[PDB]
Amino acid sequence: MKIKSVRTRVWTWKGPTVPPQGNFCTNASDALWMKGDAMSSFRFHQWLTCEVETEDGTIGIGNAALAPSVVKKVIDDWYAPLVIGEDPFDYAYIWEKMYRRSHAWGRKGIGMTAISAIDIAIWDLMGKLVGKPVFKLLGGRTKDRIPVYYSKLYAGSIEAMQKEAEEAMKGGYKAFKSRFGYGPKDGMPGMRENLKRVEAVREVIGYDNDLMLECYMGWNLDYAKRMLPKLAPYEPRWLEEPVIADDVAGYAELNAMNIVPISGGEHEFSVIGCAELINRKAVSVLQYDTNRVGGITAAQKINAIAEAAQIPVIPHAGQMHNYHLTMANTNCPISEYFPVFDVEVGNELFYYIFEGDPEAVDGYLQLDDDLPGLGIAISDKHLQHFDITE
Amino acid sequence: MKIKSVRTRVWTWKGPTVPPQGNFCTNASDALWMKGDAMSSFRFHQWLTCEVETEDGTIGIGNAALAPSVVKKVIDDWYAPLVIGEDPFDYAYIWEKMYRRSHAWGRKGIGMTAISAIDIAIWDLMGKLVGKPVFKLLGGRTKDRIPVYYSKLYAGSIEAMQKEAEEAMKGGYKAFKSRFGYGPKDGMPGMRENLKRVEAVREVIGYDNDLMLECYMGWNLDYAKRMLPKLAPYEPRWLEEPVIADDVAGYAELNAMNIVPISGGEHEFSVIGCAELINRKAVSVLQYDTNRVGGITAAQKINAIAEAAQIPVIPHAGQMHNYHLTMANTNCPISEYFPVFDVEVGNELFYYIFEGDPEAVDGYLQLDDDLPGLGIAISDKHLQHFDITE
Amino acid sequence: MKIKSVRTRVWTWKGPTVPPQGNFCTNASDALWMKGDAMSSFRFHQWLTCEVETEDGTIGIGNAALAPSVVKKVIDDWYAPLVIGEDPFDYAYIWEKMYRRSHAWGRKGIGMTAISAIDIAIWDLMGKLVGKPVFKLLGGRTKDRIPVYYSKLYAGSIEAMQKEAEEAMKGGYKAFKSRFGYGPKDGMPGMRENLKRVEAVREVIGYDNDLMLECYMGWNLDYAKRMLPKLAPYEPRWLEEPVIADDVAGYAELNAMNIVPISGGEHEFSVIGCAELINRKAVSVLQYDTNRVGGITAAQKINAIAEAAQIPVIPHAGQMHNYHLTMANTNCPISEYFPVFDVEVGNELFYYIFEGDPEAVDGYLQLDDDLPGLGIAISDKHLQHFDITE
Amino acid sequence: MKIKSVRTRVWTWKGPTVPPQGNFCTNASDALWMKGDAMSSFRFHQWLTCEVETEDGTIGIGNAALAPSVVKKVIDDWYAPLVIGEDPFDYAYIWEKMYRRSHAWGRKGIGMTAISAIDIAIWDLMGKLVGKPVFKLLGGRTKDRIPVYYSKLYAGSIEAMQKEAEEAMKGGYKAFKSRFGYGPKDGMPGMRENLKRVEAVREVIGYDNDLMLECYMGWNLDYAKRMLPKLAPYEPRWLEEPVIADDVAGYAELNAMNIVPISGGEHEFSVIGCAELINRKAVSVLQYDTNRVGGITAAQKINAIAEAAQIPVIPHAGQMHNYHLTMANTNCPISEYFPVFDVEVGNELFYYIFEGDPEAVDGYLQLDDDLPGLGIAISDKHLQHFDITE
Ligand SMILES: [Mg+2]
Ligand SMILES: [Mg+2]
Ligand SMILES: [Mg+2]
Ligand SMILES: [Mg+2]
């Protein structure tokens, strides 16, 4: 049984969205002085689906969110030819072909993202071909159920943030992640605005629950080092992406301070790429997203490396392409969970494109031991809200 | 489909054997002053087979060579109960159950060896259950064929060693491994006896081929450091196990000298165990044996770690439990090949117990893309040469 | 005078026991999701006695608790032949014979445990042969009496834990060790349950006494790093085995943080094995158990290494095989003391098998300057509570 | 004066080319077992031109060779909008806008390549706007003329390689770079084939001239370490890209051996990206290509970092986008020079698209002190050999 085709489509949301607000989420563009929504270039109002079909009609479903139209071009023009005609079960070799043939320009970023979408599809395909859930092929059930942390709580008025925290608490979660809305340019006043909101969330979820904090590459080494001592009293479980992805040295410096655990990796690429974060102890928690880092083939290898180093792997984003990996490794304790929501930043956009991603129940997710593949299908429920290009 | 039983048997060779000779192979016992064959406690004239059967009668075949009778007792009394009743495809969880429940006493040695035999069996079983060769489940075909290095050439008279080298050359190999017969206790005279034999082998295979040298834990840090400069002129590809397995610090010191690459790992256990050798750069080439280190589940993870570090993995021993792993990873360039031979040290004993292990052709081995599992079966060809206990 | 025989027996308790309770003691199996008593595979309801007798009838008594039936098989089949016919006073050579001949599979775990039981017996034998207490042969009296810390206080209701602490205080101890009942899987709520119990014990013993905390390999690097800052206010003297034994790198990372001293080693094997923990500063306090690490011959060497590094040695378990070593070295300040108790976890099981182990008086233990050997004998007081297999 | 438009075109060569040959140039795809020309995915038979025009009609010319069609899409869809309407002299800010807004997916690879083409164009534009050569704006004339090393000598028959070397010598160069045609998979026989060709080139150019050796990511850490001692006798000035670009740790290990200087960087991206190679001493010579690494803005910063570390910068490729930078920094001693040639690998393709790149005279290149900008223009001499898409 050989692969016959690779169908890649870009889905562009054209339905209503939540209007952007200022001091909502710190980001890498804050350092500039551009007008408008600072999250503009980071929102996901587009998504990519990648369907790999074999001669017998079986179809595997992969996906990606980073620069969809460009990633699609890479898949169509460069990678599809390296995949078509191959046995899905030569997945490691197929992965290596893409990685090496395009090494000059694709080892990180666009290239690796395209590899990710294809690879995820190939795994869904393999699972379907042998009638096994992807997580079973990866090792099976290491957890009776997957705990998740509520991931949202963007910065806003104290009233709005506490209102959301109260609502989130009703979900039964024992961990919550909130975003900062102020950074370096805001100086000390901004530091106080940040601390006031960390405290506000703590007032609602209390100290019997975990609180993770998200910077989304919006701070820098200097500001982050000065914030750590101020954040420690609030006992955050981790501080995510305090610096831009290129500043790995900064990550290592911050993490070695042992004031507040540093997490990151959603913007790191390839097995070696993540292996470096692990070996250099750049992070206390690794958060690659399988649809960016290189796919399930790469993520499985990364999980082995992180497990040996005993650095927890908690993938970025709550989707089946991550849940299956987490289920199969003891060093993957919990998953990130983006609640179903209106199209805001876009992390929830996949809920409108796919059917099958589990929803949290009392703070836990579950996988089906018998459902082959990833257990997802492309949805036709919101076609009227999308402009799909092929 | 659940596992129904675990059948473990110890096969004891009672047929003719090659009489022991002195200064044949250096080993960890050389440091003592015991009489008799120095390789006595290291020979493999016994082997263990482990058959894991599911309710439908499908059987997976695993094996082990270290302390067979003791390993069998551990499997029968401790691990079998943790395996029976489980889904073979929860292999990572099954592995973790054994590893953690027995962590106090089994993380290395007897315990991990028992885990290895069971795990290998579970993988053969999974392959058969879904009709796929084990290497396909692990990643597929990364090589058109597997190159191998001829592994024998024990120390002896110059005439005998050169005669064997001439014969080995007819096999078409481009790499050969030879053993030393003199160590620390033999002082400088022994160093010269060693160098004379390295040179003798080189005279036959020439410098257009690779030559690996084996110490089998028979030297020590001191002697090895003094030998390195003397060996370098002969351009050996690597020096294997120059020190006892516990002396990891010694490994690291020797390897860091960058005079002759140091290899090892056949006596290291668990994923973390091998991860340490990799991270500490204790070896330039990692050589765990899948039927010792923790099985295919562990070996697959170790291969990911070694690949990211770019330290080649060339498993100890040439058997299907290693070949399949090697085939699926680009960082596994060649395999060790023990030629079919009379029962001498015992590394060739598995040829008398199993059918299916490929034989070298012009220095290469091949795997069948369609044969499910490991592609081996227990042989009934030499039952009269064994006393099998169950 | 030569050794004539080695008699090994496994004693299986069949008398009443204390029913298992949940959240009693964190352990390496907590990470799984198995049903039943989490301490099941760790309890010691069996014990091994090893009697080495010389031609003149003198008998030395050794023992071991890890996987008794398997350890016995190793002693009977592999090590006994290397010991019989030898002079007990060639103990270092006898030790080396076992260590090197079985190095491929016994350097840690089952093998080293078997070596331990035999070696301890050989020392008791030597002491009897020359009419000297073992501690005298090791260096003599470095302390007027041996201080001990009360070791029990498993996790339970606050009322039960404080009740035990009150009772323990009546013993006059100036140090107490308590176990955690919650770990990683319990998240922040579990962290609070842990802290509440640390505080509860502190409320009873106060701050004029020392409090040690035990994780028994039930936490992981991540969770432990996050707990350290929370534990510091309670001023614990040390945090024991926060990670599984294989994670030595984790030990080193945690210990280097200098927030709470990290202790460990009860699950480490051989002289080099412990030397690595010392050199890598993996622990602030080393706790090997002589009947696991390699016996008195190995423990004596380890004590020399730890003393030079000035890392206190406080052996795991309170038995004569440890007390004698502690008495002879200035760097061994106190001993662990398991109070005589009903058969619960099993650490107290040896009290039912041997006679002679000293009991604490006002927080101190004493050794007899004239009693030859270890000063113990096999007891016939509880034969009706055991099924002894030979 | 503001930027009005960004015109990006992809030029596809459709004229005659030199037929591919085996064992011509080692590369990252050699590790696979694909059929056909191993350099297929690495050849440059396409090129990209990027023209940035201001309101007054002044046009700056930039370019790129990596994945042209994809890079073009990124420029047209993502970066053009961030550039149009801006003052060319806010180049550092323009650069930062692109780098940060697209940081999630463009920090390396496609994204940074697109930034490179635009940035180079902006510099050519600035030079034209103020009537100054780009090198003057960067610091001026630090060298009376720029020495260059002849870069070609691909692997082939000894006769062909020596014939080319003889011809190259007539050019007056004092340095030459040659490529290997054998790698890891070829084993020792391949090592000898490599050494035979290094020696053959040395026989022609002698030892009064420098010889650099190119691996083009075709070897691995293992093979490279074993080759170093064998190459040293030939006194190569450096060994280029012995490992794939992701293996920075490997680079550092190899370079630290100090056997043969290691060079690399043509596949590294961004200022921080190259800063890491410098700080980690991954290379003895840094070779980024300005039309890949991030443009002249980034290259200028990288040159400052390399100069302080005293690690020579010798940019990959001989084109004006590199020559101007080299001319302005004392730590940039020589430039790589691809001779004008038929379309073979494609490194010479730019000669058919642009007019103005200087040609070597007796081993030196010269820049015009009065010619504004980069001193190049798009050529109409070979339009019939190209299919240009806009
Ligand atoms: Mg994040
Ligand atoms: Mg070996
Ligand atoms: Mg303990
Ligand atoms: Mg190059």
UniProtKB/TrEMBL annotation, chains A, B, C, D:
Q: What class of enzyme is it?
A: lyase
- Molecular function GO labels: L-rhamnonate dehydratase activity; magnesium ion binding
Q: Which keywords describe this protein according to UniProt?
A: Magnesium, Metal-binding
In which residues is Mg(2+) bound?
214, 240, 266
* EC code: 4.2.1.90
Q: What is the superkingdom listed in this entry's lineage? A: Bacteria
Identify the cofactor(s): Mg(2+)
Per the database record, which ranges form the Mandelate racemase/muconate lactonizing enzyme C-terminal domain?
158-261
Keyword set includes Glycosyltransferase? no
> GO:BP terms for this protein?
carbohydrate catabolic process
- Family, as annotated: Belongs to the mandelate racemase/muconate lactonizing enzyme family. RhamD subfamily.
Description of how the protein assembles with itself and partners: Homooctamer; tetramer of dimers.
Q: What is this protein called?
A: L-rhamnonate dehydratase
